[PDB]
Amino acid sequence: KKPHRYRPGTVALREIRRYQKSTELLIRKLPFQRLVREIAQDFKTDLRFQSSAVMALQEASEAYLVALFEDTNLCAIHAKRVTIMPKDIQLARRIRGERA
Amino acid sequence: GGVKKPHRYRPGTVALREIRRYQKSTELLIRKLPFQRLVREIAQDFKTDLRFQSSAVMALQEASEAYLVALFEDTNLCAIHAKRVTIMPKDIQLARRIRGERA
Amino acid sequence: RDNIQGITKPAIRRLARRGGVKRISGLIYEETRGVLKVFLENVIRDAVTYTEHAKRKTVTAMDVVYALKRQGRTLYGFGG
Amino acid sequence: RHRKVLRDNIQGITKPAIRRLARRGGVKRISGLIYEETRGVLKVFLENVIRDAVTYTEHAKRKTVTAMDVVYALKRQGRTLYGFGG
Amino acid sequence: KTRKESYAIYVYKVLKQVHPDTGISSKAMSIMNSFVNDVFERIAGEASRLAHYNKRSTITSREIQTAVRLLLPGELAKHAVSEGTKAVTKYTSAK
Amino acid sequence: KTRKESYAIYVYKVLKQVHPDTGISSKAMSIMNSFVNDVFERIAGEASRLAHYNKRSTITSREIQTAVRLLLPGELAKHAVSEGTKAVTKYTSAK
Amino acid sequence: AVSRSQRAGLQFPVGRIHRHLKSRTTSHGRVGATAAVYSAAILEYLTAEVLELAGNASKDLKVKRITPRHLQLAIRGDEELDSLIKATIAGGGVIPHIHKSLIGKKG
Amino acid sequence: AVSRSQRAGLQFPVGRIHRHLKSRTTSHGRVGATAAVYSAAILEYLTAEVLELAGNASKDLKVKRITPRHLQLAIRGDEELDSLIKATIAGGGVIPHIHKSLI
DNA sequence: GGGGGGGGGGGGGGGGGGGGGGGGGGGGGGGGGGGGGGGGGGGGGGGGGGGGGGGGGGGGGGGGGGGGGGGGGGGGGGGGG
DNA sequence: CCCCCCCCCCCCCCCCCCCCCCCCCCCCCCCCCCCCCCCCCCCCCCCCCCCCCCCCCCCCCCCCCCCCCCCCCCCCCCCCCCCCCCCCCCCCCCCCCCCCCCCCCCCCCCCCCCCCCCCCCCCCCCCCCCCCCCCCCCCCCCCCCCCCCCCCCCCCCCCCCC
């Protein structure tokens, strides 16, 4: 029936624009809250969390991953690609001194 | 030939020989007096009539060579990531953008 | 379903877009997750250490803020 | 009671010295433009460090830049040095 | 309930002289307060390190001044110093 | 006055316990001296803030311990904490 | 009464800043008479500098209240503030930007 | 009269460390009895860890005195010490290494 | 080039969470004046370290040439977002 | 009926045999200078010992707020078709490394004088402390107002496909 398809890369550019325009969080909340609580459980049991604490952790993480994706993209582009790959994330963390 | 082809190492062989050599030693690689003049010249352009304890200058040299050497390791990772073995200005620039510096 | 997998491709894809990224390899999703796990371990470990020292059982925004600052990742907007 | 004008001393960081530094940093092949780039990067680095060191010197109303001044300046910028102070 | 000091009302006053008809959201005020606390900490910290390097016990406006030159980028420092000398002067000359 | 404190006699004692027939060049001792000062400034610093955040004015062995857990990497922390604990307990066992 | 702050021509709390400086001190140390004044003028100045740029960022958006996004726009947009403020601004996002080589279709 | 160091069973100076804490105090600041003791133990322990490793290296090089080069091989060589000690060690050079794609 | 289908933009509108304006309080800052104490600046003073000047010689540097190597470009394919 | 039986194509794969002059390299060896190493006091400096506060802990009291749940709402994962993109190979020219030659500037060794800086000693402007007076800012409670932001309608422009 209705045959309409955008070319690979057109929606993607639209997404970049939409998401750089906005400021909301992008990881769904409960899933992130669960991850935080599980990681914490290995350092101390029966822990509770202020709500503002989980939120600060989410704001810090997303700012960190977004900035890591910017350097990662620079590494892919340096290698003449437009697709980020694990070796680009690795090169970027290696130079930042984070190593892993 | 007569005394035949005078021996010649292939491009890269002496360069590897060099990395092994400098990597195992610890001396300062920049000549001392020229580095001292560079220091006096930059200092002077900030404030005239300054003197220097000789160890102050040695501290700046150690810091500088440690900074350059670590920057060439990062630059070398950017070249190899790009499938080259030759470092280029764009490799140095990439390393500094990611390190969060600039100029 | 493991918790770390609650951080889904779509969410990872949105973070990359805000990061100006155009095309994503399929292996990127697991790698991003490992990276986030390490970041969160480093920060929570420091937050919880501040909690225990204060003799509480509730990790507070301030414990997270002081943990982030300690790591050179200062955050504004949550106190301190 | 005399002189001597300092100019262009950045060319004292010669091509062989830069190649030695790159060898220690594990570099095998160097393009022709790396040398003027390295000089520019060293000038900036030293400017930033000398600028802070001279600020500590003046603050203390001295005319002599001390190894300690350099060491505190390297520390402020996150480049701690051991061997003179830190 | 114990008092939490904040710089909010002073940030709001400065806001009014700058854009008399503009407001500021709660989340934005929280950010400004974090910013003011952060800058005061970096400054008092450098100033007391300065004092200690020089075997002195008093944090005077002269240490605050060198600390500003060490912490702020060129222009920002130029004006800030200028704003500082100007407040001290106006305050020195008074009753 | 002129006399400057150093940690060198103490570093020598420790070196003799771990490597009885090993010496240390003056350059090397200089580095060890900076290393020790650096680590101490970092621990006292963390202990102060730590105390501050908790509205405490006293820096105890408890603040030093937490300072140590924040500053050292996993395994170094455990061994250091156990040596810290051991020396406090012994010290108080005499008073 | 007058008040230190009013006496100095500043909006920032000189008395409070002073008190705070007596606590960031070397065991038994002192604080100069004018040090608080100077500090207060420095904080006032930077606060003004950011509000001024954040305030322009919001007017050029035809809105009345400065938000975190406005603060992020003003800070990353000025070379000197960007350099001075490395903190993450919660809720600010990033400056829009697409690398030339990703934007395309080319010809 | 037993010194506080001896009383704690330490080589590092407790009295001095106590003194230095009292002067980095912060106004009405107090320093507990045992804070300096715990501090001298952490310091003596880290120092012991670094010398143990530097000393092993000066030994695998058939030599008696530890140099900055030995301190640097020992520190870059240990994951945790490397992580804890970011300072530049004057005269230590680097750990030999050449990327496989350059050989 | 045109259609065909979309997204996007612009201006306008409305409710509601957010913000604000008000009054009221009170332990706690803030400021004052007076007294006492203390950090520090000057002023020698003496010693220590830093440019500077001299001379001698060999390693470091520069320039040149040649060739091998390596980077860039182009094309194509299967494959992967 | 696509896969199956051809079909030839690059791709490797032993195979031949040394090299071979540096390249370390490793052992040895020996002056040398700096690193200890006693001496030599000695200001420092850390320990003790009352004497006097004192801050912190700890139980108790308080009470916002965290977790949890239910009801209501929404993002995710998906399998699939398509096309571009990353990769791989080949080709080619340019560029940079190796080597040679000649040169010289950095180094090394000495001293030396003069700046300048630290150290002490003297003096005193300046800060703290204190008590009193006062104002006062954060909080509670309140509670009217409002800027925003999602939504809507209508229009324009862009992209993809034909």
Residue ranges covered by each domain of chain C: 1-80
What is the C-alpha separation between A49 and A58, in angstroms, rounded?
13
E79 — contact with chain G (CB < 8 Å)? yes
| Contact assignment for F34 to H87 by CB distance below 8 Å | yes
The domain limits of chain E are 1-95
Burial category of E68 from C-beta neighbours within 10 Å (exposed 0-12, middle 13-18, buried 19 and up): buried
Q: Domain A4-100: what homologous superfamily?
A: Histone, subunit A (1.10.20.10)
What is the C-alpha separation between H103 and A36, in angstroms, rounded?
45
Place of tokens 């080069």: H69
- Cα A67 to Cα A13, A93, E42, distances in angstroms: 18, 11, 25
Helix H or strand E encompassing A99: none
**b/e string for D68-80 if b means 16 or more Cβ within 10 A?**
bbbbbbbbbeebb
CATH number belonging to domain C1-80 = 1.10.20.10
Rounded to 5 degrees, what angle do the CA atoms F55, F58, F61 make? 115
G102 — contact with chain C (CB < 8 Å)? yes
Nucleic acid strand J within 7 Å of A22 CB: no
Look at domain D3-86 and name its CATH class. Answer: mainly alpha
What is the C-alpha separation between G42 and G39, in angstroms, rounded?
5
What is the C-alpha separation between B21 and B16, in angstroms, rounded?
9
In sequence order, the 6+-apart residues with CB closer than 8 A to the CB of F76 are H46, H49, H80, H81, H84
Do H92 and B26 meet the contact criterion of CB atoms below 8 Å apart?
Answer: yes
Q: Which of C10, C25, C8, C23 is nearest to A7 (CA)?
A: C23
In sequence order, the 6+-apart residues with CB closer than 8 A to the CB of F37 are D86, F7
Q: How far apart are the first and last CA of chain D?
A: 37
The first and second tokens of residue F79, run together, are: 């061994």
In sequence order, the 6+-apart residues with CB closer than 8 A to the CB of B28 are B61, B62, B65
Do H96 and B23 meet the contact criterion of CB atoms below 8 Å apart?
Answer: yes
Q: Domain F1-95: what homologous superfamily?
A: Histone, subunit A (1.10.20.10)
Region of E60 please: left (phi>0), alpha (psi -120 to 50) or beta: beta
Q: How distant is the Cα of A38 from the closest Cα of chain C, in angstroms? A: 8
Place of tokens 């009383």: H7
What is the C-alpha separation between E38 and H43, in angstroms, rounded?
30
Q: In chain G, what residues touch A59 (CB-CB under 8 Å)? A: 88, 90-91
Please compute, for residue H29, the number of CA atoms within 13 A of its CA located in the half-sphere on the CB side: 29
What is the C-alpha separation between D19 and D12, in angstroms, rounded?
13
Place of tokens 């007058």: G2
Resolution of the structure, angstroms: 4.2
Rounded to 5 degrees, what angle do the CA atoms E65, E70, E71 make? 95
Rounded to 5 degrees, what angle do the CA atoms G50, G55, G60 make? 130
What is the C-alpha separation between H21 and D24, in angstroms, rounded?
41
Do H52 and H59 meet the contact criterion of CB atoms below 8 Å apart?
Answer: no
Rounded to 10 degrees, what is the CA torsion of F55, F61, F66, F67?
90
What is the C-alpha separation between B71 and A74, in angstroms, rounded?
18
Q: Which of F93, C48, E52 is nearest to H26 (CA)?
A: E52
Nucleic acid strand J within 7 Å of G63 CB: yes
Burial category of E53 from C-beta neighbours within 10 Å (exposed 0-12, middle 13-18, buried 19 and up): middle
What is the C-alpha separation between D55 and E46, in angstroms, rounded?
13
Residue type, H10: L
Q: In chain E, what residues touch G81 (CB-CB under 8 Å)? A: 76
What is the C-alpha separation between G76 and G89, in angstroms, rounded?
10
What is the C-alpha separation between G55 and G76, in angstroms, rounded?
14
Do A82 and G101 meet the contact criterion of CB atoms below 8 Å apart?
Answer: yes
What is the C-alpha separation between C2 and C14, in angstroms, rounded?
21
Q: Which of G86, F39, E50 is nearest to H46 (CA)?
A: F39
Which fold would CATH assign to domain B7-103? Answer: Histone, subunit A (1.10.20)
Residue type, H81: L
Q: Which of residues 21-60 of H touch strand J (CB under 7 A)?
A: 28, 30
Helix H or strand E encompassing A4: none
Domains in chain G with CATH codes: 1-107 (1.10.20.10)
Q: How far apart are the first and last CA of chain C?
A: 37
H helices of B24-100, where?
32-44, 54-81, 89-99
Deposited experimental method: cryo-EM
The domain limits of chain B are 7-103
Q: How distant is the Cα of G62 from the closest Cα of chain A, in angstroms? A: 16
In sequence order, the 6+-apart residues with CB closer than 8 A to the CB of A18 are C17
Q: Which residue of D has its CA nearest to F30?
A: D83
Please compute, for residue E66, the number of CA atoms within 13 A of its CA located in the half-sphere on the CB side: 25
Q: In chain H, what residues touch B25 (CB-CB under 8 Å)? A: 93
Beta strand D64-65 with C23-24: parallel, antiparallel or unpaired? unpaired
Please, what is the angle between helix G35-59 and helix E8-18, to 10°?
Answer: 60
Residue type, G29: G
Q: Which of residues 30-69 of C touch strand J (CB under 7 A)?
A: 58
Q: What is the largest CA-CA distance in chain C?
A: 47
In sequence order, the 6+-apart residues with CB closer than 8 A to the CB of E36 are E7, E11, G43, G46, G47
Q: What does the DSSP 8-state code read for residue D11?
A: G
Do C70 and A84 meet the contact criterion of CB atoms below 8 Å apart?
Answer: no
In sequence order, the 6+-apart residues with CB closer than 8 A to the CB of C2 are none
